[PDB]
Amino acid sequence: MGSSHHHHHHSSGRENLYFQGHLRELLRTNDAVLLSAVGALLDGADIGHLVLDQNMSILEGSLGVIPRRVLVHEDDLAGARRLLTDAGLAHELRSDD
Prior knowledge:
Layout: E1 23-29, H1 32-44, E2 49-50, E3 68-73, H2 77-86
Antiparallel strand pairs: 1-3, 2-3
Domain DUF2007: 24-87
InterPro entries: DUF2007, N-reg_PII-like_a/b
Protein name: DUF2007 domain-containing protein
């Protein structure tokens, strides 16, 4: 019981000497369409994102009781915001203020 799972991947490129954090806030909205657009953009580029603030059940959603907020991993913090600005829409973007 338990086959020999032996894989190997050699990669050592730890040149990132900074970035003490993890997550930063990008934008927010309750609009299902906008949330789908931004989601597809980040998902399509394999960008580690977080749009799950709170999620209302799929049994007929409300008009604006549950708003979501879009964060991404600081690994691609500038990259995701670059994408959303350059080839997304650039509008509801907020900073870590």
